[PDB]
Amino acid sequence: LKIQFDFPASFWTEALPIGNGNLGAMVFGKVEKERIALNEDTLWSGYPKDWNNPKAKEVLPKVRELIAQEKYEEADQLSRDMMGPYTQSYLPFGDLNIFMDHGQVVAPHYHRELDLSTGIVTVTYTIGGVQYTRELFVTYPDRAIVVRLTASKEGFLSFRAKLDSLLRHVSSVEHYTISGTAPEHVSPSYYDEENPVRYGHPDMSQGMTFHGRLAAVNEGGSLKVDADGLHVMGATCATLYFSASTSFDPSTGASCLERDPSLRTIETIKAICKRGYKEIVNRHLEDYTKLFNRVSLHLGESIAPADMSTDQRIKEYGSRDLGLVELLFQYGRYLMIASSRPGTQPANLQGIWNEETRAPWSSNYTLNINAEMNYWPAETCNLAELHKPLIHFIERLAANGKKTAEINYGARGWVAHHNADLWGQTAPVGDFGHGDPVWAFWPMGGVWLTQHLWEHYTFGEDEAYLRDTAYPIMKEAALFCLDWLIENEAGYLVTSPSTSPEQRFRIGEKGYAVSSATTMDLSLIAECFDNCIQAAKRLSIDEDFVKALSDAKQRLLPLQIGKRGQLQEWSNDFEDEDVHHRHVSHLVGIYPGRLITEQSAPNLFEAAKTSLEIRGDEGTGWSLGWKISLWARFKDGNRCERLLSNMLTLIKEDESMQHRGGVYANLFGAHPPFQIDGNFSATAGIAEMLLQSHQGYLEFLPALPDSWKDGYVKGLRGRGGYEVDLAWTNGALVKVEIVSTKTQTCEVLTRISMRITESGEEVEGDVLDSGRMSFQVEKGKRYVLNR
Amino acid sequence: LKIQFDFPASFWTEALPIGNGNLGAMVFGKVEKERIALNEDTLWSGYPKDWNNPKAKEVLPKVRELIAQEKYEEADQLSRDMMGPYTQSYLPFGDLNIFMDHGQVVAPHYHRELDLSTGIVTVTYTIGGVQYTRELFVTYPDRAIVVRLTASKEGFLSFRAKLDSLLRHVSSVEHYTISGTAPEHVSPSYYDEENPVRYGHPDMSQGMTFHGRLAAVNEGGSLKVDADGLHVMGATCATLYFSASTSFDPSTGASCLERDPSLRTIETIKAICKRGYKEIVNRHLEDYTKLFNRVSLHLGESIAPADMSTDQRIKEYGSRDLGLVELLFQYGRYLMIASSRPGTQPANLQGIWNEETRAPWSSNYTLNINAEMNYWPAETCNLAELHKPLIHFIERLAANGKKTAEINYGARGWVAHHNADLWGQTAPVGDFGHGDPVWAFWPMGGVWLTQHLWEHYTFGEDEAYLRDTAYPIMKEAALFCLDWLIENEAGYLVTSPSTSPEQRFRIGEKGYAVSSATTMDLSLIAECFDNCIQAAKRLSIDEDFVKALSDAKQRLLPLQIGKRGQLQEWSNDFEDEDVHHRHVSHLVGIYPGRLITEQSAPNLFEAAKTSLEIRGDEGTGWSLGWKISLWARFKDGNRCERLLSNMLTLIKEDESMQHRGGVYANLFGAHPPFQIDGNFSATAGIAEMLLQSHQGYLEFLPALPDSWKDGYVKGLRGRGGYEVDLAWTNGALVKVEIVSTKTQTCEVLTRISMRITESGEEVEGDVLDSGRMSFQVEKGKRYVLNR
């Protein structure tokens, strides 16, 4: 499993990603003047800004009146008075440049790779008979980027290394460093406002301080450091260490003056330099392996030559190379491991990798699908602890969101809208009126995120986590919903204003944004109430609160099937402004939610399928990814493969179609431009095709493509504390292994009759209603199913 | 006439070239982090090396014996003992980086251009309603690269600028500077030998020293300089000035201790900073215009939209857009003005623009076609003084070549082989045996170069130049030829060993390199003798020498027509190892030489046409350029257009075919990679299609394509001291205007009867055969010819 090339990267999307959750780098593999793009996941512009809007509360009753009177045009216009500032932006830390003294021409067979089994990037090339090798990785245990350089001939390693950055900074020197203060404001890439990048006076800025420290250890030759960088002369081998830090305090959610980044980096560099290279690399391998090796997937032998570069592989084989599908699957797990380790910030639109001052859409946390999508594979793909950064980010939003709910809406609980940043902005964006209400006015970000808090529990069954962390936040989110819901003329509970993520409805020759009770709103709120009810009972508390949520849920405006036989996206059967809109917000209840299933709502389930069909199989990287899981839920394995085929389409940096999804040379997901959400949904989608556990039973191979004849997957997790392994041959399940962390009744759905054994002895299983079979499992024991 | 793009360059071959003959720059036009690749035309690796080989003189008689015995294999092997070192390399000075503080996103309509009428690069873009403009040019009068930056709003111009380089250097600070010593050795890009880049120890190094100096003048805001570069904060307008120099002494051909680069740049910088920006620009425009406006070409209105980017223009129209053809023509003149001003070094393989440490083929002076090609348009396109740098370089070669002639061959005169560098290496390359004799052993470099010395006289007729500069060198070249020539069995004069540039001949399956008296040898020698004879007579001297050259010439082995009816490339009718070889060395007598014409050798002339036919119309950019003029001499305008069409093929930097000629996005010629010879041949070829004067008469429209129905050209020069203007309509010459700097008899050849008038009065003309007509012209007067 490698992403490789026989040529150095020319474009950032051809570079190789490495990271330890906090520090990130993109390796180009250039022969002479190497560039290693750097990132520190807390490096953002700004500080906690006054984002709430009291005027929102003032106009709320009027906008609702307008909506009730179907004066959508006036309602959309007035909603521009219920907005807030655009969030801040994720900044590019800088570059690590290494100038080799041997020229840029090499002998044939140049090679660079990222090995997903080791998380190590290797670069090799030869000049005049002398072989040079490079090993680069970002170690979590020793908190640093490591670059190991070697020459096959003694004394043939000479270079100059130094840091640089697009951000205002000052450099200085036994280490080479850079430091400064982040800008206090950066306008989103799409908002062409005057003075897009603003630095405060270096004496009073509220921007966070940052610091980068580069050190080197030479084996042979000499080493010196001056204004021009680190100079290694006549060595044979050398190791470069880089550490970065900021004044951002994850506990307060704000910059802290008492936090000195230069002291943190020097502490980090001094520590790593005391360990030998082999020790450092081995500590990294052991750390990485414990997470990566939890899951093993095999869909068959790869039909592509082993020497082929990944870009040619994608273009010439696509999803036809089952080895490429496996690589894609594991790439998602790899990227989560390298961008979302506990204690670090959750992966943003670009994980942690970004080279642009004004990155696309601020490279922030987009809460109307993208941020959530980033974590869809956390639980199922056995990276549960990697969900923590989001969980803790949600705790912060819950804290900030309480004030937003109070000020903008006069409601209890907490709310979050469609965009959030490092600071945890919970108020809507749109710079108080500039943004389009179809996407700017959306108060369901918090309601959606509660699902992640809950899923962390459904998968791990940790009562303490639920009681002390999850439930409290989930409950507060539900309270806000109880206040956000209002009775309509008919007496049903609805939301108003209400929008369906980025999709306008049309009447006549016009398109409108806001109306009342969109299907996403109703689905998300219903799901939140359900999860809260389940949580409360599990904890045997809030008997009355449960009643209130039950009554409210019962009073929600019922979902509807439109004249096209499709699940209606709005409370009225309006015409879509775009029948192929990339978002499928009204299907959130099918996936990632579980509100609507063939069992729970047969007619709504089928109608949802019709909506998906009308929507089509095209879209951005993330849209394709969403549809993969949706169709997996619909049990259409062949359609899943088709969408998988579409995402495995080589996209280039000069792509002109704004919504042409795919992947770049380095397999990074393409919106375009680079958007990591697609990588995470591809991974989650694949798991959902092989295993599902949201309907009260473990269903095996729910959506296996007819072309995936033989294979296996080991280490997937299922709700209820289950870890599952399964294998198949000739397109049919042949063997399953289940281990539960809890003694309970296990229920499974297989298409063929299976016998159960534990320690080789038969286990009694009741073949219930359908092909569903339940049986008792004891915590820790391994149960095997055979035909 | 512009080369423009609506996008900043991502590749070097998309960047815009500017220069003043000595200082060169490639402008990318990037929005935030701008890169301006720098060059100083005397910055090369090494120093005068011990390149001659006395052993060559010892094996000369043996090799001659082996060849006579037709032991070609043993001869080729032994010729490896008659070689020398590979030349040194042209180095990349470094970069001028400008970090803007406004982010990288701009509003629609980004624009960058190189206006050939002003020699100025302009870049414009708008951010948040503020427009930023940049004007860059390299001024000859004020010896510096100038970068003018403006912002439409007060205080909105802030940036950091600094220099960097891939060469070993040290930086230091009111100006920001970098300096160092060039390596003492750089191996050619194609020679993969151990330790490709070698720097001498600083205590004894003989490499030249170099210095780059950057200064800034701000209008508004503040300015400061430190280790991080020049910092302009809150200004409105600013001008950056860059100057570079080396210890290379052009008069001695070697580095000079007394020539302090740092002092030369500070003098230049201090001086320019004292002048106002408007003053600086106008001095530049005045200087530039005086050279560029000498020639005007019109082939009709361009069919491409005025706002089209050049790369798209080439791709979509090619030679069909006559406007693009005009641009291609003038670009060649532009590049000569920017790369070869009096006092600077002659245009090398890449003019003066190079970013690579080990540039392709050392970006040196390749004398078996390329170097000569660079100056093909110097005379005919009215840029005679720009020929001087080549003339002076030839003077140096004649000096160094005398030692080579004596040591390697025991001959009089001087010799030059196929590769030369700044140091003026006149000895063969091939690292004493490594190189292939088919290209390494070729002692006709100087013999060919004498043609340029002579042409500077044929066109300008400066007797003092001929008597004191050209003739002495020409004669010394002929003297070498008299000694290099030996008698064969039949008593004919031949050369041995002899090679035909890069092409081997076959005998059975095997390919051989050396033989005796190749056609190029015989052609170049004869032309040299012919030119010397005509020079001696014009000077009325060396009556005895003339007879000696006349007799020798008459004893040269006659040229032959092969079994395919083709002009034989070798003295024996051998099989070609490659029927489509890119070189056409045996046709040098057709063009650029004038030895073989329909009048001088009708049968040979025809056979040469067959040879060309067999060779094909494909090839590298230079091959195509050569074929343009050859077909122009064959008077096949339509065929000339086919070749022109072939060169106007957009090539991209990832072109896999090593010999696919064309042009890059910035109209730079493609070999590939970038090779300027193609640009110069294209310009010269086009001129040769409209006017010829090598046969004793000014022939008008000798090879006009049928598609070039109407147009005109003004400012072309003809041998004999003539400046010509001519216009045509409906495919036929309609008007000609001639001005002679010499009172003499003028002979013209028009394919249509013309009337002659001067200041109103009819001028008597005497009709001759083949459409010719002669008439008397008085120095300075303008003679107009009408149908």
Tab-separated table of C-alpha atoms in Angstrom, chain B residues 72-382:
chain	number	residue	atom	x	y	z
B	72	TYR	CA	36.515	2.895	-39.426
B	73	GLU	CA	35.885	1.034	-36.177
B	74	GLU	CA	39.546	1.224	-35.114
B	75	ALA	CA	39.639	4.838	-36.290
B	76	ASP	CA	36.617	5.871	-34.203
B	77	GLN	CA	38.231	4.220	-31.197
B	78	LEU	CA	41.561	5.961	-31.729
B	79	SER	CA	39.857	9.332	-32.243
B	80	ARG	CA	38.937	9.101	-28.556
B	81	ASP	CA	42.582	9.888	-27.826
B	82	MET	CA	42.235	13.163	-29.737
B	83	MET	CA	39.644	14.769	-27.480
B	84	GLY	CA	39.562	17.248	-24.609
B	85	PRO	CA	37.501	18.228	-21.549
B	86	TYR	CA	33.798	19.049	-21.562
B	87	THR	CA	33.259	22.808	-21.289
B	88	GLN	CA	32.055	24.605	-18.186
B	89	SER	CA	28.446	25.598	-17.533
B	90	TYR	CA	26.356	28.779	-17.589
B	91	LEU	CA	25.003	29.243	-14.050
B	92	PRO	CA	21.728	30.622	-12.623
B	93	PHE	CA	22.390	33.750	-10.551
B	94	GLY	CA	19.406	33.202	-8.285
B	95	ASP	CA	16.020	34.791	-7.581
B	96	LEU	CA	14.467	38.066	-6.497
B	97	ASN	CA	11.511	37.130	-4.287
B	98	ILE	CA	8.822	39.649	-3.398
B	99	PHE	CA	6.358	38.668	-0.669
B	100	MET	CA	3.129	40.672	-0.917
B	101	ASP	CA	0.994	41.002	2.232
B	102	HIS	CA	-2.434	40.921	0.543
B	103	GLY	CA	-3.063	37.206	0.088
B	104	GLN	CA	-3.109	35.327	-3.205
B	105	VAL	CA	-6.742	35.693	-4.270
B	106	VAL	CA	-7.557	38.395	-6.820
B	107	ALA	CA	-10.732	39.631	-8.516
B	108	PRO	CA	-11.497	38.563	-12.094
B	109	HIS	CA	-9.260	39.891	-14.893
B	110	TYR	CA	-5.744	39.216	-13.587
B	111	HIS	CA	-3.360	40.239	-16.379
B	112	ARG	CA	0.356	40.037	-17.199
B	113	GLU	CA	2.142	40.877	-20.432
B	114	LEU	CA	5.442	41.545	-22.149
B	115	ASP	CA	4.948	44.325	-24.694
B	116	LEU	CA	7.531	43.881	-27.468
B	117	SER	CA	7.191	47.538	-28.478
B	118	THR	CA	8.370	48.734	-25.052
B	119	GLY	CA	10.292	45.790	-23.648
B	120	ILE	CA	8.255	46.220	-20.472
B	121	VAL	CA	6.464	43.562	-18.470
B	122	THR	CA	3.273	44.782	-16.836
B	123	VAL	CA	1.235	42.915	-14.221
B	124	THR	CA	-2.175	44.037	-12.932
B	125	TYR	CA	-4.740	42.596	-10.536
B	126	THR	CA	-7.318	43.851	-8.074
B	127	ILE	CA	-7.944	42.812	-4.488
B	128	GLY	CA	-10.881	44.108	-2.501
B	129	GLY	CA	-11.273	47.030	-4.892
B	130	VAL	CA	-7.605	48.024	-4.727
B	131	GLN	CA	-5.675	47.657	-7.984
B	132	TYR	CA	-2.021	46.723	-7.902
B	133	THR	CA	0.240	47.271	-10.894
B	134	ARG	CA	3.786	46.216	-11.600
B	135	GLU	CA	6.163	47.266	-14.364
B	136	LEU	CA	9.379	45.336	-14.806
B	137	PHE	CA	12.182	45.831	-17.294
B	138	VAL	CA	15.951	45.598	-17.489
B	139	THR	CA	17.399	48.908	-18.519
B	140	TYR	CA	20.560	49.099	-20.598
B	141	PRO	CA	21.214	52.827	-20.003
B	142	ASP	CA	21.013	52.431	-16.238
B	143	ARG	CA	22.343	48.847	-16.068
B	144	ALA	CA	19.717	47.351	-13.768
B	145	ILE	CA	16.558	45.326	-13.344
B	146	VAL	CA	13.712	47.655	-12.376
B	147	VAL	CA	10.506	46.689	-10.590
B	148	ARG	CA	7.851	49.382	-10.114
B	149	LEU	CA	4.988	48.597	-7.722
B	150	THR	CA	1.827	50.638	-7.167
B	151	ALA	CA	-1.415	50.335	-5.213
B	152	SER	CA	-4.491	52.421	-6.137
B	153	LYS	CA	-5.201	53.224	-2.481
B	154	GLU	CA	-2.879	55.128	-0.162
B	155	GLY	CA	-0.869	52.928	2.185
B	156	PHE	CA	-2.015	49.633	0.641
B	157	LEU	CA	1.418	48.575	-0.611
B	158	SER	CA	3.406	46.428	1.842
B	159	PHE	CA	5.886	43.683	0.992
B	160	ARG	CA	9.203	42.035	1.807
B	161	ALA	CA	11.818	41.511	-0.890
B	162	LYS	CA	15.019	39.506	-0.789
B	163	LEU	CA	17.496	37.560	-2.896
B	164	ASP	CA	18.275	33.863	-2.843
B	165	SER	CA	20.390	31.479	-4.878
B	166	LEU	CA	21.080	27.803	-5.514
B	167	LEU	CA	24.772	28.670	-5.673
B	168	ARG	CA	26.808	28.728	-2.470
B	169	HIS	CA	26.641	32.279	-1.148
B	170	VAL	CA	26.403	34.507	1.911
B	171	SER	CA	23.818	37.241	2.339
B	172	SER	CA	24.268	40.568	4.140
B	173	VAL	CA	22.820	44.053	4.552
B	174	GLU	CA	20.611	50.008	3.171
B	175	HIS	CA	20.849	47.343	0.443
B	176	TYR	CA	20.242	43.600	0.681
B	177	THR	CA	23.019	41.588	-0.945
B	178	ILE	CA	24.284	38.095	-1.675
B	179	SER	CA	27.785	37.159	-2.845
B	180	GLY	CA	30.082	34.203	-3.262
B	181	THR	CA	32.517	32.376	-5.492
B	182	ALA	CA	31.248	30.268	-8.396
B	183	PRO	CA	32.129	26.567	-8.409
B	184	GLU	CA	35.402	25.656	-10.145
B	185	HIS	CA	33.675	22.798	-11.938
B	186	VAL	CA	30.218	21.826	-13.128
B	187	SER	CA	29.707	18.654	-15.187
B	188	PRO	CA	27.431	18.885	-18.239
B	189	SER	CA	23.850	17.829	-17.509
B	190	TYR	CA	24.308	14.743	-19.727
B	191	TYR	CA	27.611	13.579	-18.209
B	192	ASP	CA	26.637	11.678	-15.059
B	193	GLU	CA	30.077	11.702	-13.478
B	194	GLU	CA	30.783	11.566	-9.752
B	195	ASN	CA	30.892	14.928	-7.932
B	196	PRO	CA	29.106	17.029	-10.651
B	197	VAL	CA	29.430	20.330	-8.788
B	198	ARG	CA	32.802	21.313	-7.363
B	199	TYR	CA	33.706	24.375	-5.318
B	200	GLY	CA	37.350	25.093	-4.642
B	201	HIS	CA	38.477	25.700	-1.080
B	202	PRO	CA	38.030	29.448	-0.433
B	203	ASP	CA	41.729	29.969	0.298
B	204	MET	CA	42.831	29.021	-3.206
B	205	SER	CA	39.687	28.860	-5.381
B	206	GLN	CA	39.990	30.213	-8.920
B	207	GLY	CA	36.253	30.549	-9.450
B	208	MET	CA	34.979	34.051	-10.218
B	209	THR	CA	33.292	35.996	-7.425
B	210	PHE	CA	29.780	37.335	-7.912
B	211	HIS	CA	27.571	39.906	-6.237
B	212	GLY	CA	23.895	40.816	-6.354
B	213	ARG	CA	22.620	44.064	-4.822
B	214	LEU	CA	18.972	44.910	-4.118
B	215	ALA	CA	17.681	48.359	-3.169
B	216	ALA	CA	14.267	49.967	-2.741
B	217	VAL	CA	12.726	53.433	-2.861
B	218	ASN	CA	9.319	53.840	-1.249
B	219	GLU	CA	6.680	56.481	-1.843
B	220	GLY	CA	4.851	56.667	1.466
B	221	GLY	CA	5.171	54.243	4.363
B	222	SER	CA	8.469	53.067	5.796
B	223	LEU	CA	11.508	51.153	4.594
B	224	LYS	CA	13.936	48.987	6.507
B	225	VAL	CA	16.491	46.318	5.694
B	226	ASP	CA	17.609	43.389	7.842
B	227	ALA	CA	18.519	39.711	7.430
B	228	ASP	CA	14.993	39.041	6.172
B	229	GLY	CA	15.352	41.375	3.201
B	230	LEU	CA	13.918	44.770	2.281
B	231	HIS	CA	10.657	45.632	4.035
B	232	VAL	CA	8.224	48.189	2.603
B	233	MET	CA	5.371	48.955	4.966
B	234	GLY	CA	2.239	50.981	4.243
B	235	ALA	CA	3.619	52.699	1.149
B	236	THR	CA	1.652	53.503	-1.986
B	237	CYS	CA	4.296	53.115	-4.667
B	238	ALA	CA	7.755	51.588	-4.542
B	239	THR	CA	10.553	50.814	-6.951
B	240	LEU	CA	13.016	47.973	-6.481
B	241	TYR	CA	16.407	48.097	-8.185
B	242	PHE	CA	18.655	45.083	-8.709
B	243	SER	CA	22.229	44.960	-9.950
B	244	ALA	CA	24.623	42.029	-10.334
B	245	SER	CA	28.282	41.727	-11.314
B	246	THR	CA	31.189	39.259	-11.364
B	247	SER	CA	34.972	39.364	-11.358
B	248	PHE	CA	35.026	38.199	-14.998
B	249	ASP	CA	37.210	40.555	-17.048
B	250	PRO	CA	35.839	40.624	-20.640
B	251	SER	CA	39.135	41.947	-22.019
B	252	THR	CA	41.256	39.096	-20.649
B	253	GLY	CA	38.713	36.292	-20.745
B	254	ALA	CA	39.409	35.479	-17.109
B	255	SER	CA	38.450	36.431	-13.566
B	256	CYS	CA	40.285	39.494	-12.256
B	257	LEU	CA	41.208	40.152	-8.628
B	258	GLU	CA	40.960	43.923	-9.149
B	259	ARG	CA	37.408	43.706	-10.475
B	260	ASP	CA	35.385	43.924	-7.238
B	261	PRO	CA	31.740	42.897	-7.948
B	262	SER	CA	30.367	44.432	-4.734
B	263	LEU	CA	31.755	47.846	-5.675
B	264	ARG	CA	30.470	47.643	-9.234
B	265	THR	CA	26.904	46.902	-8.082
B	266	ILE	CA	26.862	49.605	-5.395
B	267	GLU	CA	28.027	52.196	-7.929
B	268	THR	CA	25.244	51.102	-10.274
B	269	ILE	CA	22.611	51.017	-7.542
B	270	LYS	CA	23.587	54.352	-5.995
B	271	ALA	CA	23.461	55.995	-9.408
B	272	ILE	CA	20.056	54.665	-10.507
B	273	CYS	CA	18.449	55.494	-7.150
B	274	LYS	CA	19.236	59.152	-7.807
B	275	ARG	CA	17.075	59.250	-10.961
B	276	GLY	CA	13.286	59.601	-10.976
B	277	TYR	CA	11.182	56.638	-12.081
B	278	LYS	CA	9.748	58.444	-15.104
B	279	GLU	CA	13.275	59.463	-16.092
B	280	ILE	CA	14.476	55.849	-15.793
B	281	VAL	CA	11.579	54.454	-17.844
B	282	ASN	CA	11.975	56.984	-20.640
B	283	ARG	CA	15.721	56.421	-20.851
B	284	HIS	CA	14.884	52.729	-21.254
B	285	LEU	CA	12.123	53.216	-23.839
B	286	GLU	CA	14.311	55.614	-25.821
B	287	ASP	CA	17.158	53.092	-25.835
B	288	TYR	CA	14.931	50.092	-26.599
B	289	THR	CA	12.825	51.735	-29.312
B	290	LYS	CA	15.911	52.775	-31.310
B	291	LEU	CA	16.710	49.107	-31.916
B	292	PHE	CA	13.273	47.511	-32.064
B	293	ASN	CA	11.532	49.992	-34.378
B	294	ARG	CA	14.169	49.532	-37.086
B	295	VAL	CA	12.061	46.773	-38.610
B	296	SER	CA	8.325	46.559	-39.187
B	297	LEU	CA	6.510	43.500	-40.496
B	298	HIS	CA	2.869	43.185	-41.476
B	299	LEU	CA	1.293	40.018	-42.834
B	300	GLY	CA	-2.257	41.099	-42.073
B	301	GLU	CA	-4.635	41.559	-39.148
B	302	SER	CA	-4.524	38.916	-36.424
B	303	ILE	CA	-7.565	36.646	-36.367
B	304	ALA	CA	-7.099	35.914	-32.666
B	305	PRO	CA	-9.075	37.905	-30.085
B	306	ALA	CA	-7.035	40.752	-28.567
B	307	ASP	CA	-7.414	39.406	-25.031
B	308	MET	CA	-6.323	35.839	-25.785
B	309	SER	CA	-3.463	34.338	-23.772
B	310	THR	CA	-0.419	33.499	-25.885
B	311	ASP	CA	-0.400	29.803	-25.032
B	312	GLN	CA	-4.015	29.477	-26.166
B	313	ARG	CA	-3.191	31.583	-29.220
B	314	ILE	CA	-0.427	29.221	-30.364
B	315	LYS	CA	-2.496	26.096	-29.687
B	316	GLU	CA	-5.620	27.265	-31.497
B	317	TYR	CA	-4.182	29.146	-34.479
B	318	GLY	CA	-0.510	28.364	-34.955
B	319	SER	CA	0.833	29.849	-38.178
B	320	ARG	CA	-2.737	30.454	-39.400
B	321	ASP	CA	-2.837	33.609	-37.290
B	322	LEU	CA	-0.527	35.799	-39.348
B	323	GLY	CA	-0.404	38.105	-36.340
B	324	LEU	CA	1.214	35.308	-34.316
B	325	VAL	CA	3.724	34.843	-37.124
B	326	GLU	CA	4.597	38.536	-36.930
B	327	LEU	CA	4.993	38.216	-33.154
B	328	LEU	CA	7.252	35.181	-33.564
B	329	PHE	CA	9.370	37.188	-36.004
B	330	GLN	CA	9.674	40.248	-33.773
B	331	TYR	CA	10.226	38.109	-30.674
B	332	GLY	CA	13.485	36.905	-32.192
B	333	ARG	CA	14.596	40.519	-32.652
B	334	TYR	CA	13.442	41.318	-29.112
B	335	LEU	CA	15.409	38.447	-27.615
B	336	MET	CA	18.564	39.528	-29.448
B	337	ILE	CA	18.162	43.057	-28.088
B	338	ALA	CA	17.696	41.658	-24.583
B	339	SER	CA	20.518	39.103	-24.774
B	340	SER	CA	23.243	40.491	-27.039
B	341	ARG	CA	23.943	44.212	-26.541
B	342	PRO	CA	27.443	45.549	-27.359
B	343	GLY	CA	29.800	44.929	-24.451
B	344	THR	CA	27.983	41.825	-23.194
B	345	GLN	CA	28.490	38.133	-23.933
B	346	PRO	CA	26.900	36.552	-27.015
B	347	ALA	CA	23.600	34.707	-26.694
B	348	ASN	CA	24.303	31.159	-25.518
B	349	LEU	CA	22.003	28.107	-25.846
B	350	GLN	CA	19.470	29.914	-23.669
B	351	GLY	CA	20.284	33.513	-24.511
B	352	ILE	CA	21.002	34.665	-20.976
B	353	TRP	CA	18.036	33.047	-19.230
B	354	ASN	CA	18.680	29.955	-17.119
B	355	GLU	CA	17.455	28.738	-13.728
B	356	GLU	CA	19.265	25.365	-13.653
B	357	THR	CA	22.560	24.590	-11.920
B	358	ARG	CA	23.394	21.948	-14.544
B	359	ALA	CA	21.505	23.438	-17.470
B	360	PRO	CA	20.826	21.353	-20.613
B	361	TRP	CA	24.066	20.753	-22.538
B	362	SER	CA	25.721	23.333	-20.261
B	363	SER	CA	23.694	26.145	-21.892
B	364	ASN	CA	27.010	26.905	-23.607
B	365	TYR	CA	28.076	27.893	-27.102
B	366	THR	CA	27.515	24.934	-29.391
B	367	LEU	CA	29.422	25.694	-32.584
B	368	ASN	CA	28.177	22.993	-34.932
B	369	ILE	CA	24.990	25.015	-35.659
B	370	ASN	CA	23.327	26.485	-32.561
B	371	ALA	CA	25.646	29.391	-31.754
B	372	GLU	CA	25.818	30.364	-35.423
B	373	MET	CA	22.025	30.112	-35.674
B	374	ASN	CA	21.550	32.600	-32.810
B	375	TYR	CA	23.059	35.301	-35.012
B	376	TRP	CA	21.406	34.432	-38.315
B	377	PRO	CA	19.038	37.414	-37.997
B	378	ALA	CA	21.591	39.957	-36.698
B	379	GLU	CA	22.397	41.460	-40.098
B	380	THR	CA	19.278	40.936	-42.240
B	381	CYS	CA	16.963	42.069	-39.447
B	382	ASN	CA	18.795	45.360	-38.791
